[PDB]
Design a protein around this ligand. Structure first.
Ligand code: 494
Lengths: 548, 428
């Protein structure tokens, strides 16, 4: 049989037993349809009839496919799968085309009857036992078991991949002018060899595999570029995404919105400028998978922009190790960032976008840093080096920022590209208090029940103000106090606040938020020349005038 | 070599399975290096290739070792350690000398190579599985498991402990005043001798161990050293909680006194016997920040009384062996970093400041990495165990770049903080 391939030893999960499920049922119309399959599988040595000796057992169902000339046997291994040991996880992610090297020729070989071509560990086989019944009347049910990897069995993919990998080594040893990538039941071979000897080599590999019991395309030899693979279009000199289709609807489903943002973020690999923000903000509600969700003007505008970019196709190229790797980032402005990875000006390996969905308040430089981080990781995964960066930020700007920042930040080799909207910090608080500046002592408070509260200040010039607030919180009033001090002061101002929160926001130097209060505070801070924010403990009775 | 005896059986704490941990993506360079190293280890029988029926995995990295110019493989065993040695700090646990921290000088030696001689229990090997990753998921990763006691596993020195004791015993006889503690792949040797005599004795232990068949590639510059001064020698008697200092100026301002009162009020959580009342009086209300405010009698009395109370260590602060060690670090800028090692909040077992040299040979991540290593080493010497760090850095950044600067053979536990407040200028 298929014995030459060395079996992989398999244990059941410790402290368990094989599946004992008995099958009497059910229908006689599909029984003699099952026998037709089982006899031909038995003759092919894939399954073997087992006897009276009281083995285990598993349910077996029969079903059909359209164009009924093809019958289907489906064995349910779920229980056994519960009871079998864990295996090394099969390859999770898939190789990204931007990391592939251009080869003079590429061939695709799928192996048919894959799992059934790899033997199953002998001692384990008894646990794969199953029964085909008859209708009563002193007839013992037909008992079989698998000699090979059962379709749907837990350990089948990993053991198969292991076996293929092994079988490939006596070949790849004799031929390292040719590179073989392995994915599932597919082998992707490529070479810079002359086309004739490339073809010859391919056929050699074919006869090798066939000698080991692995079938492979004969009629044809099949796929010629493209090469529609895993949602891609692979062309000899270029790669792109499988065509993207955005549906048009009067009423949008949260499900369809998930499919939408999915197709869009998928499209973002290559088409530059894709914005998922508003459409995803729609999905921010985590409730009710069937709920009909309306749109927003910003959302529909965004979808329109996406349709406009998607209208005209752009293509990605393949990787050249001799050429440097460059990543370039541009700010979209809504908290969204875009980037392209290229060794060439008019050709991109790929593109992508980074958005900060964490929390609310974060500034431009930190966001740029995080983007550089994501790009660095992605580049390590796809290529194995890190790119040189082209960033829209002045040297002195980033230097000042990282030197002033409480967290340790690191960026690799990078240079300043002059393309606006250049990233900058709009205001820098004073390191030391300002002489000849009005000193505002600010405070704010709220009743967490009534939710009214108030915000105000008292200056050293004897100037005082108290502004009533409605529908707010202590934090809101506390920012409102600083804002109030900003409105009523001159170009140079000293503010003193009792709260760690407000000081925390202000010192953080954010340039934007969804909080309009903080936005206006920012605008004030920009309009100001010198602002010194200082902190003191509350209720310590020093400079603070509070109330209740 | 050969099995001198049978293998020491390793039993995991019952009701717990082996480590399954994803392998980080690596640079092509580091992958190639790992491939060379592992091919070599495979030829020498140290490790073997495994099939898909081994579910377990443990991360692997390629570090630069020491100032040496060639690569080194570093396995991150933290998970497996937690899953085994936690029961093997019990059964085989190595005692920790309390006199190591009191020595004038402590040298660290790499004894790891020893472990390579000893075989590992056949049943246990499957838990040591690791993977050399492939770029771009193009080929399935290369999978090995250890056939011998692996470096970085805490059970390794536990198993080799008797051997180490036998080899060390003669040296301890000729040198009864020298303290020697083993932590994983490292040997810490303390002494009160002169620095020269100390290094001499260290070389004596080197030649001793070597002629007993235990290699320690600590050979430094050979004949004539260029540039860099020496290497690793600790001085643990200089390690203690640092006193908190109040700013001292000829004159004070409203704002200065504000910062002072603030810092003192913060310090009240540590040293409850501080009185801030007289200190915030002198500015009664509504003054300009830059207004100069001379201090009264009772004010200066309070300041001095608070100065001498802050220069002496806390009360009720002791090391709890049942509790984990926690290390906070905060960035002070200009190359300086400060750190606190504690167990319960505001009770500090140790505090310090790590400072490297500036001028564009260094960056932030390098400094933090070296700081973490230094603190971890101090912690090893003092308590015989490593702290869990709260690192002021973005998780992905740290996870990316930490292996570049990492000279140490162990890995402490860590987690990341996005919060920290005004407590920066208060700790320096
Ligand atoms: N189904 C399916 C295929 C899927 C598939 C999937 C992968 Cl990960 C790779 C693949 O083909 C390749 C195989 C091996 C190498 Cl070194 C490059 C390849 O480049 C492919 C790009 N290419 C394609 C054609 C050509 O002439 N030149 C060229 O560089 C095919």
């Amino acid at each position: 049989p298929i014995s030459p391939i060395e079996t992989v030893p398999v244990k059941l999960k410790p402290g368990m037993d094989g599946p004992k499920v008995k099958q009497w049922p059910l229908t006689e119309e599909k029984i003699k349809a099952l026998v037709e399959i089982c006899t031909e599988m038995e003759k092919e040595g894939k399954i073997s009839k087992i006897g009276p000796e009281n083995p285990y057992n598993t349910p077996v169902f029969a079903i059909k496919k359209k164009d009924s000339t093809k019958w289907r046997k489906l064995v349910d291994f779920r229980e056994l799968n519960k009871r079998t040991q864990d295996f090394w996880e099969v390859q999770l992610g898939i190789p990204h085309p931007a990391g592939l090297k251009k080869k003079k020729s590429v061939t695709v070989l799928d192996v048919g009857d894959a799992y059934f071509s790899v033997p199953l560990d002998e001692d384990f086989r008894k646990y794969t036992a199953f029964t085909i019944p008859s209708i009563n009347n002193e007839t013992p049910g037909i008992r079989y078991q698998y000699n090979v990897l059962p379709q749907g069995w837990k350990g089948s993919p990993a053991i198969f991949q292991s076996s293929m990998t092994k079988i490939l080594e006596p070949f790849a040893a004799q031929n390292p002018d040719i590179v073989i990538y392995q994915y599932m039941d597919d082998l992707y071979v490529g070479s810079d060899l002359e086309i004739g000897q490339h073809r010859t080599k391919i056929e050699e590999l074919r006869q090798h595999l066939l000698r080991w019991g692995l079938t492979t395309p004969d009629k044809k030899h099949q796929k010629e570029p493209p090469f529609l693979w895993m949602g891609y279009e692979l062309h000899p000199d270029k790669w792109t995404v499988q065509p993207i289709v955005l549906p048009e609807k009067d009423s949008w489903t949260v499900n369809d919105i998930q499919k939408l943002v999915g197709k869009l973020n998928w499209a973002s690999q290559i088409y530059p400028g894709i914005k998922v923000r508003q459409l995803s903000k729609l999905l921010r509600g985590t409730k009710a998978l069937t709920e009909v969700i309306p749109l927003t003007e910003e959302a529909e505008l965004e979808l329109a922009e996406n349709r406009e970019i998607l209208k005209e196709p752009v293509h990605g190229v393949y990787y050249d190790p001799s050429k440097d790797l460059i990543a370039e980032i541009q700010k979209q402005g809504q908290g969204q960032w875009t980037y392209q990875i290229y060794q060439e000006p008019f050709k991109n390996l790929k593109t992508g976008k980074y958005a900060r969905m964490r929390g609310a308040h974060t500034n431009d430089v930190k966001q740029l840093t995080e983007a550089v981080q994501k790009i660095t990781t992605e580049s390590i995964v796809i290529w194995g080096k890190t790119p040189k960066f082209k960033l829209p930020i002045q040297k002195e700007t980033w230097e000042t920022w990282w030197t002033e920042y409480w967290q340790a930040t690191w960026i690799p080799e990078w240079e300043f590209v002059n393309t606006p909207p250049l990233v900058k910090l709009w205001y820098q608080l004073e390191k030391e208090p300002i002489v000849g500046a009005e000193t505002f002592y600010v405070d704010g408070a709220a009743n967490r029940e009534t939710k009214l509260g108030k915000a105000g200040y008292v200056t050293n010039k004897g100037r005082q103000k108290v502004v009533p607030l409605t529908n707010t919180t202590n934090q809101k009033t506390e920012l409102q106090a600083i804002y109030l001090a900003l409105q009523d002061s001159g170009l140079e101002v000293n503010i003193v606040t009792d709260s760690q929160y407000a000081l925390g926001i202000i010192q953080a130097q954010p340039d934007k938020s969804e909080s309009e209060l903080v936005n206006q505070i920012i605008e004030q801070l920009i309009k100001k020349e010198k602002v010194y924010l200082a902190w003191v403990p509350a209720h310590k009775g020093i400079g603070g005038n509070e109330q209740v | 070599p050969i099995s001198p005896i049978e293998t020491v059986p390793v039993k995991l704490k019952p009701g717990m399975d082996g480590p399954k941990v994803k392998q980080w993506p690596l640079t092509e360079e580091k992958i190639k290096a790992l491939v060379e190293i592992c091919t070599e280890m495979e030829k020498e029988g140290k490790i073997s290739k495994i099939g898909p029926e081994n579910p377990y995995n443990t991360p692997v990295f390629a570090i630069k070792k020491k100032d040496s110019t060639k690569w080194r493989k570093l396995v991150d065993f933290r998970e497996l350690n937690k899953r085994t040695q936690d029961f093997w700090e019990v059964q085989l646990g190595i005692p920790h000398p309390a006199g190591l921290k009191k020595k004038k000088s402590v040298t660290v030696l790499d004894v790891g190579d020893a472990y390579f001689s000893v075989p590992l229990d056949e049943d246990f090997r499957k838990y040591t599985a690791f993977t050399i990753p492939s770029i771009n998921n193009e080929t399935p990763g290369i999978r090995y498991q250890y056939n011998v006691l692996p470096q970085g596993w805490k059970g390794s020195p536990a198993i080799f402990q008797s051997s180490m004791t036998k080899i060390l015993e003669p040296f301890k006889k000729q040198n009864p005043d020298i303290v020697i503690y083993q932590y994983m792949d490292d040997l810490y040797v303390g002494s009160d001798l002169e620095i020269g005599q100390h290094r001499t004795k260290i070389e004596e232990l080197r030649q001793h161990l070597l002629r007993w068949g235990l290699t320690t590639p600590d050979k430094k510059h050979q004949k004539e050293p260029p540039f860099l001064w020496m290497g690793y020698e600790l001085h643990p008697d200089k390690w203690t909680v640092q006193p908190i200092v109040l700013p001292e100026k000829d004159s004070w301002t409203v704002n200065d006194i504000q910062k002072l009162v603030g810092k003192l009020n913060w310090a009240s959580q540590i040293y409850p016997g501080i009185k801030v009342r007289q200190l915030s009086k002198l500015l009664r209300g509504t003054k300009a920040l830059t207004e100069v405010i001379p201090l009264t009698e009772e004010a200066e009395l309070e300041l001095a009384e608070n100065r001498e109370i802050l220069k002496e260590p806390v009360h009720g602060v002791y090391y709890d062996p049942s509790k984990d060690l926690i290390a906070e670090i905060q960035k002070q800028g200009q190359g300086q970093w400060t750190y606190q090692i504690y167990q319960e909040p505001f009770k500090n077992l140790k505090t310090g400041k790590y400072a490297r040299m500036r001028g564009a040979h260094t960056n932030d991540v390098k400094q933090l990495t070296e700081a973490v290593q230094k603190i971890t080493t101090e912690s090893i010497v003092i308590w015989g165990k490593t702290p869990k760090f709260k690192l002021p850095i973005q998780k992905e950044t740290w996870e990316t770049w930490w292996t570049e600067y990492w000279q140490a053979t162990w890995i402490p536990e860590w987690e990341f903080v996005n919060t920290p407040p005004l407590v920066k200028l208060w700790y320096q």
